[PDB]
Amino acid sequence: MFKLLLIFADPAEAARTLSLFPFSLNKENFYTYHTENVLLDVMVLKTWGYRGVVQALSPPPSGYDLWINAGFAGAANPNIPLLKTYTITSVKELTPTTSVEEELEVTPIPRLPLAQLTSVRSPYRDGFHEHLQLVDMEGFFIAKQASLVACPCSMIKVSSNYTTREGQDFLKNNKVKLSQKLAEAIFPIYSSFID
Numbered sequence: 001m002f003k004l005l006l007i008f009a010d011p012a013e014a015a016r017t018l019s020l021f022p023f024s025l026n027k028e029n030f031y032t033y034h035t036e037n038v039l040l041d042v043m044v045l046k047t048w049g050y051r052g053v054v055q056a057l058s059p060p061p062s063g064y065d066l067w068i069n070a071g072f073a074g075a076a077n078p079n080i081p082l083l084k085t086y087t088i089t090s091v092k093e094l095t096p097t098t099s100v101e102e103e104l105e106v107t108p109i110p111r112l113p114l115a116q117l118t119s120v121r122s123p124y125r126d127g128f129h130e131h132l133q134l135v136d137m138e139g140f141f142i143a144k145q146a147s148l149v150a151c152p153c154s155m156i157k158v159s160s161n162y163t164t165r166e167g168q169d170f171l172k173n174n175k176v177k178l179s180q181k182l183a184e185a186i187f188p189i190y191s192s193f194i195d
Helices: 011-020 139-148 168-173 175-192
Strands: 002-008 031-035 038-044 066-075 085-095 100-105 114-119 134-136 153-162
Touching (some): 002 175, 011 038, 011 066, 085 139, 114 139, 168 175
Parallel strands (some): 002 038, 002 066, 066 153
Antiparallel strands (some): 085 153
């Protein structure tokens, strides 16, 4: 039986994927669906409060065959169009006060175009950057937790806004369309593992 964990950072990201399958909430308080040889579980990292906490994925869930982190990502290069779905080749955590970075490779999903992801605690609204492509908050954390259980991790990131002050309104106003893009990327993957 193939065991797939989908990880969303927040309910807006998860919303349309949760509509795709008839999930139920289990006694452990997260969504699950199974059919044929495939178990599909969904975790949402931040349902409460102003920030996510480390204990959302710590200890990391063991026993899955693949993790997919699907989420929104800001675009920090104007040659990235919005509402476009990418898969990630590597993800960098960046700490702006020291410039220290760490970086991990992630497993690209077939058929999706490639991008690099940078994860930061505070969303960029500085403007555009020569060195950055997509920017999120939780990608690196998820990839590193996946390594603790030796589980492959893939990322799907949809470009949700440009990383500017004026750019934030587009994210505010398009969460359903953006979530739907994630759902449309997850479905063919789910279908590939039907034996």
